[PDB]
């Protein structure tokens, strides 16, 4: 009966692991052990955006790499001018419990959500001058984790109900619902072509979804704790993964197996956010040690420490231009490093 | 140097970063609270008494205090992964059912939940307002059924006052940081205003202590 199906699933998992082992021939360290180290990198803060009055939880850059939106628990999300440290907008929120924010690639819309189960959409290019709530996407029965825009008419959201859902802005109803996670989804990253996305949950697993039909292509396991952050490689063929095991892991879409783990005996705290650089040579991870560690993404060497925060670094993002990285922490401060 | 438009832009970004100051001042002055407890432990009755989908926010002005309130039990998810959002709350209103000590036992789950909540890293300095509910039915329930079933390691009279005092003393020692935080325990007074009055008194105590610590007078 169901025992036969369970045994079939077990043997399928065993043969999948055997196939993954067979394709495993040389780790990334062995391939890149001949490369020159990036060397000690010193990145000094250039701007400090102040004005938030509570522990911030979200930040997102614009496609022009000058405007970034950040959300905090004071019920406000602010779009900043990075060059001049100017607050262009301050949008009040119906619910102060915000855990994510998004900036539309066109720049016309922003999204925010949290414990209220609603990924609100705000209209910036309005003839009336003020920012209005375009649509409130409700009906997802769980705290939202990562709203991300596909276009001006679509959005991808992740909640604590173990389901990711692709929505439609103008109709207000979700086009596709992604199911398969057995733990609370907490992270989401979009591929550069917006054709695939990967999410991490409490199951210590990152699942590669497909926007077109919704089936889950590949499931990546190997973490020993929940996943708090996900980010693709710029090439789009790989993605990093931050967890509470104090280990960032780099995964491969094509090889479908873990590639390299980033660990140091000194750090024993979780990882709240990860990112990459334009070339993908180094990736920045925001720990709870009140500092951000820059890891050489090809040698697993700590290249430098971005220690400038007095509390846990909630999130960090790297511009599309690759010129600077902005980190946000629970002390209600945004630091643009360069 | 700045152009004609950049001066207007910084004036805009200075009025925006002027309204934020008043917004934060309003947010700090008001009082925030949490609701926690087991299922059907009396959250609905206290909420409806004090009033007169993930977060059931409640507002009620009493003695010139906004008294923002959050009922979080509506949404079921990893408690440990959003419990840090409520760090910095003024106090946690914890509802305990006195008469649920024998059904499946639930007093053991209530005390376990209280121990888990009071010993969180985030809820170190946040005082906990403790409510003991449905004492009226509790009186007759202990008149009929002995208390030793819930508490095997007990020896004492089976009267209402002594049993309630022992339950209060047992619950008040769960916390280990007795020096930093203080638990305010209360028995709900049926349909009187005394419950809201006690909540106001406890939050006033917490605010006074927090203000002293901010001034360094502590």
């Amino acid at each position, epitope marked *: 009966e169901l025992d036969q199906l369970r045994q079939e699933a077990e043997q399928l998992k065993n043969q999948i692991r055997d196939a993954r082992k067979a394709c495993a021939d040389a780790t990334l360290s062995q391939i890149t052990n001949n490369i020159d180290p990036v060397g000690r990198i010193q990145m000094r803060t250039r701007r400090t955006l102040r004005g938030h009055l509570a522990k911030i939880y979200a930040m997102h850059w614009g496609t022009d790499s000058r405007l970034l939106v950040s959300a905090s628990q004071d019920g406000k999300l602010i779009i900043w*001018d990075s060059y001049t440290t100017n607050k262009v*907008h301050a949008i009040p929120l119906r619910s102060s419990w915000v855990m994510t924010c998004a900036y539309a690639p066109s720049g016309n819309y922003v999204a925010c959500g949290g414990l209220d189960n609603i990924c609100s959409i705000y209209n910036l290019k309005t*003839r009336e*001058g003020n920012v209005r709530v375009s649509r409130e996407l409700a009906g997802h029965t769980g705290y939202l984790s990562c709203c991300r825009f596909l276009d001006d008419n679509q959005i991808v959201t992740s909640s604590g109900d173990t389901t990711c859902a692709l929505w439609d802005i103008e109709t207000g109803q979700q086009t596709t619902t992604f199911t398969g996670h057995t733990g609370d989804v907490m992270s989401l990253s979009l591929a550069p072509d917006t054709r695939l996305f990967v999410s991490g949950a409490c199951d210590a697993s990152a699942k590669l979804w497909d926007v077109r039909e919704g089936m889950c292509r590949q499931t990546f396991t190997g973490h020993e704790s929940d996943i708090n952050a996900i980010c693709f490689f710029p090439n789009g063929n790989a993605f990093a993964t931050g967890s509470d095991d104090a280990t960032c892991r780099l995964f491969d879409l094509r090889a479908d197996q873990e590639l390299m783990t980033y660990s140091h005996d000194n750090i024993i705290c979780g990882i709240t956010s990860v990112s990459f650089s334009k070339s993908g040579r180094l990736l920045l991870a925001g720990y709870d040690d009140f500092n951000c560690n820059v890891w050489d993404a090809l040698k697993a060497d700590r290249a430098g420490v971005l220690a400038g925060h007095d509390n846990r670094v909630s999130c960090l993002g790297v511009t599309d231009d690759g010129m600077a990285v902005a980190t946000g922490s629970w002390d209600s401060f945004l630091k643009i490093w360069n | 140097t700045l152009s*004609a438009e950049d001066k207007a*832009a910084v004036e805009r970004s200075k009025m925006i970063d002027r309204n934020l100051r008043e917004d934060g001042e309003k947010a700090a002055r008001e009082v925030k609270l949490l609701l926690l407890g087991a299922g059907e432990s009396g959250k609905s009755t206290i909420v409806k008494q004090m009033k007169i989908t993930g977060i059931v926010e409640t507002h009620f002005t009493f003695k010139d205090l906004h008294f923002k309130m959050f009922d979080v039990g509506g949404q079921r998810s990893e408690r440990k992964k959003w419990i840090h959002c409520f760090e910095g709350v003024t106090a946690i209103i914890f509802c305990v059912a006195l008469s649920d000590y024998d059904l499946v036992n639930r007093m053991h789950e209530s005390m376990k939940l209280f121990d888990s909540i009071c010993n969180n890293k985030w809820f170190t300095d946040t005082s906990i307002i403790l409510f003991l509910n449905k004492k009226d039915l509790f009186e007759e329930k202990i008149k009929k059924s002995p208390l030793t079933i819930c508490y095997p390691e007990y020896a004492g009279s089976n009267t209402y006052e002594e049993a309630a005092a022992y339950i209060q003393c047992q619950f008040e020692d769960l916390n280990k940081r007795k020096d930093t935080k203080e638990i305010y325990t209360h028995f709900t007074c049926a349909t009187d205003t005394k419950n809201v009055q006690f909540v106001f008194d406890a939050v006033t105590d917490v605010i006074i202590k927090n203000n002293l610590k901010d001034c360094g007078l502590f």
Partner: single-chain antibody
Amino acid sequence: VQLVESGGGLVQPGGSRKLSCSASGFAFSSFGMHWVRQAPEKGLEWVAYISSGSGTIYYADTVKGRFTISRDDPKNTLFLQMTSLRSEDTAMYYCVRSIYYYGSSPFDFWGQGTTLTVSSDIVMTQATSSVPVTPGESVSISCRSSKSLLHSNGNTYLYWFLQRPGQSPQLLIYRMSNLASGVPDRFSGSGSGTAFTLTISRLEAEDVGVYYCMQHLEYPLTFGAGTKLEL
């Protein structure tokens, strides 16, 4: 949006008049108001500017001291108190809204205008004051400035306006490159410091009028003479 102004009419020289503008359909409290007159036969001319929150107020030198401007945020009304009106003060007083932030489009919407009848700086010159045109043609209007308008940050402060016959001006291109909202993509602006061009592709009806070029580099604000188009 709706900007309507009233209070114009005949007045004897040296008297006082109180122009008022009623603003509806937009967040008046956030927008900075302008007053722009236009002589019965001459071009447009900037008058005064009040910022959001009535913080910074600027006046043209020709009306400094004599004219004061105030705004009423909760009632959504803008005033322009005028004292000691002179003969040259007879003009078409337009009301213009302008929002100033990164990526905004100032001078986007214009009012109707009150009829008032009384019985150092960057100078703008437009090379040609009249260009005959025909349907389907493509003309390039040229406008020059005394000083190069390319600021250090990289924003070149130019504005192109279009005066329909017997109507209100409409913003076409702001900062020489960015098209205003609701404007067809036919128009195109380009150029460099002190040399500006406006390329119109496949111009059609409801497009003939007078085109003005504006500088926003520094106050006072000045316009070109006005290139007038006929069929």
